[PDB]
């Protein structure tokens, strides 16, 4: 009857590292191998209470008694130095390959049916729509999350590393490439074919991505903020902790990964957002709203069962999304 496997699991392809950030001056960014790092330091902030009243305590007495007791914090900031106007974010990317085979499967019948379906997809049309959009998200610096929103000029350099040295150098201007359109460029197609050859083959493909952002002298950069619970006691507790790998601020690896998977423009709602990240039941945690609900037949699970079990091959955009979920990885399975 070809029932679904009870255990399904895919390894994460497109594996990025922790994006270190450093600082320096623009127009000597070519010799940016010995730039010093951006360090996370504490600063103490205070202010009054700004949020809305709970409507039963609106009286002026406790209002003025509340603005005479400001809250006191100790936050972390990461600032550029006062003699540098460029933020240099650099991380390494591995495109692994073998993007169809599950890392765990109960049924061998489900396994070779799914492998046949993935092979049917890749010889019908290879990874050339997905790798185009992955090369877009590496081209326009979407991995610079809040570090992008006011920059004068962003330039992204991607160098494909061979066994020991740079096999092919790219150079982009991330502000000329928008955050919502996936057009066609020559170097974008060359990078997309490199990611395609990575995703199809068996060996890994290593990429080094550098992103310079010309913000300004001494402005604030924004690394990842560490999710900690059970924080402690209010005399010594810190309110906001930034990520730091080895005394140097850094964006988390999964934040870079969530930036690179922003290719999903095929969700049924209107694209006032544009592309979102690829998730089963595609949910935007900044929006708080889970698109691709299971009541419509456009989530990942039902699309995969219709593509493998009962062989209803959906629209080519939806199987692009399905193979994007398979490159994303995941742990699927009922009881």
């Amino acid at each position: 009857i070809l029932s679904t496997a009870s255990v399904l699991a895919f390894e994460r392809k497109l594996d990025p590292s922790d994006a270190l950030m450093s600082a320096g001056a623009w127009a000597q960014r070519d010799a940016s191998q010995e730039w010093p790092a951006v360090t996370v330091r504490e600063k103490s902030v205070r202010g009054t209470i700004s949020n809305r009243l709970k409507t039963k305590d609106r009286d002026p007495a406790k209002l003025d008694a509340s603005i005479q007791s400001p809250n006191l914090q100790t936050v972390d900031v990461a600032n550029l130095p006062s003699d540098a106007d460029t933020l240099k974010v650099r991380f390494t990317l591995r495109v692994l390959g073998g993007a169809g085979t599950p890392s765990a499967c109960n049924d061998a019948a489900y396994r070779d049916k799914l492998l046949q379906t993935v092979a049917t997809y890749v010889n019908d049309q290879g990874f050339a729509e997905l790798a185009r959009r992955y090369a877009h998200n590496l081209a326009n610096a979407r991995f610079l999350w809040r570090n992008r929103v006011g920059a004068e000029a962003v330039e992204v350099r991607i160098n494909h590393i061979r066994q020991g040295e740079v096999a092919r150098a790219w150079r982009f201007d991330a502000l000329a490439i928008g955050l919502r359109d996936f057009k066609a460029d020559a170097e974008l197609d060359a990078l997309a074919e490199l990611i395609a050859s990575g995703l199809s083959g068996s060996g890994h493909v290593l990429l080094e991505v550098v992103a310079f952002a010309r913000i300004g002298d001494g402005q604030e950069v924004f690394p990842s903020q560490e999710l900690i619970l059970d924080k402690g006691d209010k005399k010594g507790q810190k309110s906001k902790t930034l990520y730091s790998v080895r005394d140097a601020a850094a964006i988390h690896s999964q934040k870079i990964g969530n930036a690179l998977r922003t290719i999903d423009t095929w969700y049924p709602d209107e694209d006032g957002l544009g592309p979102i990240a690829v998730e089963p039941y595609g949910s935007v945690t900044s929006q708080g709203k889970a698109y691709r609900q299971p009541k419509q037949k456009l989530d990942f699970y039902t699309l995969l069962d219709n593509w493998v079990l009962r062989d209803e091959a959906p629209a080519v955009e939806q199987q692009h999304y399905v193979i994007a979920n398979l490159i994303r990885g995941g742990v699927f399975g009922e009881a």
Binding site: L227, G236, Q237, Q254, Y281
Partner: peptide
């Protein structure tokens, strides 16, 4: 990737942010 909370001797772990469920 640990962090010592304020006023304790032991340590805790820095976690990752999971995606939401299908309801939000």
């Amino acid at each position: 990737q640990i962090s010592q909370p304020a006023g304790k001797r032991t340590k805790v772990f820095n976690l990752t942010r999971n995606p939401l469920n299908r309801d939000g």
